[PDB]
Amino acid sequence: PPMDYAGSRPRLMDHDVTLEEIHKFFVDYMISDTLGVISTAHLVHADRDPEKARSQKCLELANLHSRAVDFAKTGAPAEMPYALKPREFPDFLERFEKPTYISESVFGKLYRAVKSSLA
Amino acid sequence: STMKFCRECNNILYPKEDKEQKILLYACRNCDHQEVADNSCVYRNEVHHSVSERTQILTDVASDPTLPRTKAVRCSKCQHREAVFFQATARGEEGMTLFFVCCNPNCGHRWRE
Amino acid sequence: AILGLEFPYEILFQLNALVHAQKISLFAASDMELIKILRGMSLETALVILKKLHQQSSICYDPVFFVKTQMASAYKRLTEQNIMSCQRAYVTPSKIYLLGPELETANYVVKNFAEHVSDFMRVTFVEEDWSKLPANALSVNSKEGYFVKPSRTNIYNRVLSILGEGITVGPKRFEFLAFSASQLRGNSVWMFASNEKVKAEDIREWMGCFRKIRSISKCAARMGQLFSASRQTLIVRAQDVEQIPDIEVTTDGADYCFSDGIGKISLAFAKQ
Numbered sequence A: 001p002p003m004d005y006a007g008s009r010p011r012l013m014d015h016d017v018t019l020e021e022i023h024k025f026f027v028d029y030m031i032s033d034t035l036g037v038i039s040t041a042h043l044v045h046a047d048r049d050p051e052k053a054r055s056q057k058c059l060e061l062a063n064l065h066s067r068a069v070d071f072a073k074t075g076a077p078a079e080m081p082y083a084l085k086p087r088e089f090p091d092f093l094e095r096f097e098k099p100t101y102i103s104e105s106v107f108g109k110l111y112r113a114v115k116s117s118l119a
Numbered sequence B: 001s002t003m004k005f006c007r008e009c010n011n012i013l014y015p016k017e018d019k020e021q022k023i024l025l026y027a028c029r030n031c032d033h034q035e036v037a038d039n040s041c042v043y044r045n046e047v048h049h050s051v052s053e054r055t056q057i058l059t060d061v062a063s064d065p066t067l068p069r070t071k072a073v074r075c076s077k078c079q080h081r082e083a084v085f086f087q088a089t090a091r092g093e094e095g096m097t098l099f100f101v102c103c104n105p106n107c108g109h110r111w112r113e
Numbered sequence C: 001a002i003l004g005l006e007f008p009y010e011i012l013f014q015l016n017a018l019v020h021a022q023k024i025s026l027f028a029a030s031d032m033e034l035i036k037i038l039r040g041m042s043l044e045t046a047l048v049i050l051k052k053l054h055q056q057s058s059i060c061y062d063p064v065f066f067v068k069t070q071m072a073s074a075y076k077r078l079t080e081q082n083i084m085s086c087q088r089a090y091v092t093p094s095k096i097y098l099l100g101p102e103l104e105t106a107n108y109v110v111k112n113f114a115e116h117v118s119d120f121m122r123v124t125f126v127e128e129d130w131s132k133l134p135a136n137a138l139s140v141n142s143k144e145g146y147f148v149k150p151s152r153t154n155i156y157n158r159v160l161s162i163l164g165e166g167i168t169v170g171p172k173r174f175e176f177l178a179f180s181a182s183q184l185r186g187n188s189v190w191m192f193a194s195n196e197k198v199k200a201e202d203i204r205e206w207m208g209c210f211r212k213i214r215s216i217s218k219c220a221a222r223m224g225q226l227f228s229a230s231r232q233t234l235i236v237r238a239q240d241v242e243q244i245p246d247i248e249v250t251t252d253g254a255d256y257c258f259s260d261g262i263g264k265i266s267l268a269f270a271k272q
């Protein structure tokens, strides 16, 4: 079954826009903008823990991703938790400064095949 | 609940209404003196709940209820399930929106719905 | 105030862009001789020599010697392939970099306002390395009292002041018009220089009336949605439009709507 598509409650103001709160929203959009890290964390957690997309961690990541993609429509921050950070990246990434771990998933096999073909 | 003393004999006055005069008047029963009223106010009391005097400390009347607590929600900064939820208005928004406060003594994090 | 003359805006903008680039310093182009030479000349030749100087591989020390040794269509482009020259600006916490009149695809807002092609300027807020601003540079968290409360940094106030007062480049002052959905994810915003003919408020009210929307994000989204690249077609009045009812189904206590943005078109409309 698919996940629920019900979004957050809309925020309605009691007064008209005075061109200041829109600037506040535009500046605050940079803060707590975790749209790009949720997908990376989900991929890392799927590659690490077997039986991926079955545990509650993947469901929480998907819900957070939906809430973050709803940020541009409704003013609801994603609120990315600290404990869900990957702190580890597979070989098929450009994060050379970050620690690299050898992945044994299907993506790891594909990357090894590509490396062997190029070499 | 107001009271005043007529300048003639310095005695309490009771309010009364006259159909012909169509105005508020005060006259005491001690002397036949009638004076004009001011502000047309005969009763003014601030509503208070101080009825059970010297009894609200022994028996818990529960004047200020405690906020409910839930364990279904999960905090973000810490992995604690207990949190306090309540409804309150925003700074400029309309309606009631749900809030959450973490119950972890070492977390101190609050977030909206 | 140093110039105090009728110097054009395009040449001044090009000079500012060249100074911002690591080609010529500030005082090397602020002398009287350079502006005296650049004041009265041919405009096309002046633009050609300015862009040639901007194309110099290394840093130029003497601009006067270089410039001594060196010596309509917009509407058609918009109608053909929507080709416009839009100014792009980069605002950093330290300074501001002007890229220059880079060619880019034109949007709908410049179709009916093609005479102010130079008043439109794209402003992007980046870091010193022209990268995205980190979350620690804006509203750093601090534990004050029983609960944690974010504390706004000076960069936050600087961005607010830039958005409010606006950016002044020569004899112009750019004002905030709107930002598209893609620009919100790229920290970009459109700015239009107010003129005696049409101001920013005039364009804003010409696009539509946004006072009906009571949501902060929804109002911005609706104001910025009409900035995508598109091809101009014929004009249709408001006399022949239908009001077909839609279909809704409510199962398991959930509102599921089949028709979200679906529509209906004819064959003659497709041919036209």
Ligand SMILES: [Zn+2]
Residues within 6 Å of the ligand: B006, B008, B009, B010, B011, B028, B030, B031, B032, B033
């Ligand atoms: Zn009396």
Ligand SMILES: [Zn+2]
Residues within 6 Å of the ligand: B075, B076, B077, B078, B079, B080, B102, B103, B104, B107, B108, B109
């Ligand atoms: Zn907590």
